[PDB]
């Protein structure tokens, strides 16, 4: 599969650390579209791009998108492609 679309939930010290702003720079680095959002006390991401770029994006986020972050856990789900995505947004 050339492209992937993923649901990524990241847990730990992931709020009040610039997580959404730092995730945006990683999305720009690897040509990723989708969203980053604060949900309750964790972070939820939808991410779409080429397979290797998605791998690079996941690792950059879960190794701590922000230097202030401490990611303790993540959950990943593989999704059907979303052809309405055209950029990466902090929501």
């Amino acid at each position: 599969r050339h492209m992937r679309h993923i649901h990524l939930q990241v847990f730990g010290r992931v709020q009040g650390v610039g997580f959404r702003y730092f995730t945006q720079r990683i999305a720009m680095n690897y040509n990723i579209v989708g969203t980053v959002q604060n949900v309750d006390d964790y972070v939820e991401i939808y991410a779409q791009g080429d397979d290797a770029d998605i791998e690079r994006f996941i690792q950059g986020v879960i190794e701590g998108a922000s230097p202030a972050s401490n990611v303790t856990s993540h959950q990943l789900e593989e999704l059907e492609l979303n052809q309405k995505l055209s950029d990466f947004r902090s929501i």
Side-chain angles (χ1 to χ4, degrees):
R1 296 182 68 234
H2 189 100
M3 280 177 61
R4 296 166 55 191
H5 181 210
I6 61 149
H7 181 216
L8 175 64
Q9 295 169 313
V10 308
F11 304 98
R13 179 175 77 249
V14 296
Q15 292 190 352
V17 294
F19 209 90
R20 294 163 302 179
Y21 192 51
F22 280 89
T23 295
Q24 287 222 231
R25 171 60 206 237
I26 305 172
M28 262 290 315
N29 284 351
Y30 308 115
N31 311 292
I32 305 305
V33 296
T35 59
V36 59
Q37 189 180 29
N38 282 180
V39 172
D40 186 14
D41 60 2
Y42 68 96
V43 163
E44 177 172 76
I45 292 158
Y46 287 90
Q48 174 166 288
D50 287 0
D51 180 22
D53 283 332
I54 282 290
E55 283 300 317
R56 300 176 183 118
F57 172 83
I58 296 164
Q59 179 186 4
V61 168
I62 69 155
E63 289 190 1
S66 169
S69 66
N70 179 236
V71 174
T72 57
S73 175
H74 75 277
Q75 204 72 34
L76 176 302
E77 182 176 0
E78 208 65 46
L79 305 178
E80 300 291 344
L81 302 178
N82 178 4
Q83 302 289 355
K84 329 166 190 72
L85 295 183
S86 66
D87 57 359
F88 196 91
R89 293 188 198 171
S90 188
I91 65 176

